[PDB]
């Protein structure tokens, strides 16, 4: 399982559900589906309402199964997952992070701002230099040039938002 984790704005847009929840109990495996599921107690729901007590994810690590590594049971996590057959699915690649670990700007993005750049803007992942830009509505996400991952200035403080009709640039939160 090799992954290119999305920007948090990209994760807010591809996800059907975005919630705060607490993981409660170990996972239970159903060998018919090849998926496991964790019992969750949802706290708040920033994106959804068209559809929670369970989240489902692939059962093995090699097929991008999410394995919860937290031991603190009271810890709230932000989960952004997709709805398959009315069921909440996440992967190793889904944006799932402790709520407290997110920067203040990321919390503003999930709560209010990320949705403003959702209809028209697009965060474009730059895996190498030279990186090709495809349209004025793409923001090149260059934090890959560093150690990588969601720890990056563009992930923690910037969102791909529109300045003009037809033009989206990175802006601060």
């Amino acid at each position: 399982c090799t992954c290119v984790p999305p920007h948090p704005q990209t994760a807010f847009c591809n996800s059907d559900l975005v919630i705060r929840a607490k993981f409660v109990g170990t996972p239970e495996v159903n060998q018919t589906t090849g998926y496991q599921r964790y019992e969750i107690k949802m706290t708040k729901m920033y994106k959804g309402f068209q559809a929670i007590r369970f989240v489902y994810t692939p059962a093995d690590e090699s097929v991008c199964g999410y394995f919860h590594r937290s031991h603190n049971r009271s810890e709230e996590f932000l989960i952004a997952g997709k709805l398959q057959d009315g069921l909440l699915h996440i992967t190793g690649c889904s944006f799932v992070a402790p709520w407290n670990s997110l920067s203040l700007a990321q919390r503003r993005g999930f709560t209010k701002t990320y949705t403003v750049g959702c209809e028209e803007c697009t965060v474009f992942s730059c895996l190498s230099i030279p990186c090709k830009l495809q349209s004025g509505t793409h923001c090149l996400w260059t934090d890959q040039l560093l150690n990588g991952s969601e720890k990056g200035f563009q992930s923690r403080h910037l969102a791909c938002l529109p300045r003009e009709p037809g033009l989206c640039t990175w802006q601060s939160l």
């Binding site: 399982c1 290119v4 992967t91 890959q144 990588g148």
Partner: protein, 160 residues
């Protein structure tokens, strides 16, 4: 359960190819990805052209005949299965990506070496430099690509 291959000599087949790059390139990256592991272990690999081999390498988009459909371009790039019979040991590459001979975009050799590592019975590493790290790490030049010591110790604890 400590899953690993119960045989030193394994076979592999490249069932389909991607239109992103030439067939020669796909073969070269696959045989280089297998070499990465051959040079550290007693494992040896033989290529089949028909039938079903131990490791069946495929390119696919979205739903493609297993329980884990790919997710279009972006996010996941590929998955594989632990050793075993049937689908176990196979490697699936999301072809909604743009696969490359070189180091632009997504290098087919990097992702193949990772997935083969899963096909051999390795799990993911917490060391970001390790090849078994889950996040795609593109290198500035493949010339000085080195297999991490975490990866060597894992594969040698499995096979010797």
């Amino acid at each position: 359960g400590i899953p690993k291959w119960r045989k030193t000599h394994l076979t592999y087949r490249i069932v389909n190819y991607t239109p992103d790059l030439p067939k020669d390139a796909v073969d070269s990256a696959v045989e280089k990805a297998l070499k990465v592991w051959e040079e550290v272990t007693p494992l040896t690999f033989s290529r089949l052209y028909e039938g079903e081999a131990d490791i069946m390498i495929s390119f696919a988009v979205r739903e493609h005949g297993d329980f884990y459909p790919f997710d279009g371009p972006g996010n996941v790039l590929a998955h594989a299965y632990a050793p075993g019979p049937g689908i176990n040991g196979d490697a699936h590459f999301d072809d909604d990506e743009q696969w490359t001979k070189d180091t632009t975009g997504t290098n087919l050799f990097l992702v193949a070496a990772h997935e083969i590592g899963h096909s051999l019975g390795l799990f993911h590493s917490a060391n970001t430099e390790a090849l078994m790290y889950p996040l795609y790490h593109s290198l500035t030049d493949l010339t000085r690509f080195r297999l991490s010591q975490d990866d060597i110790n894992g594969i040698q604890s499995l096979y010797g």
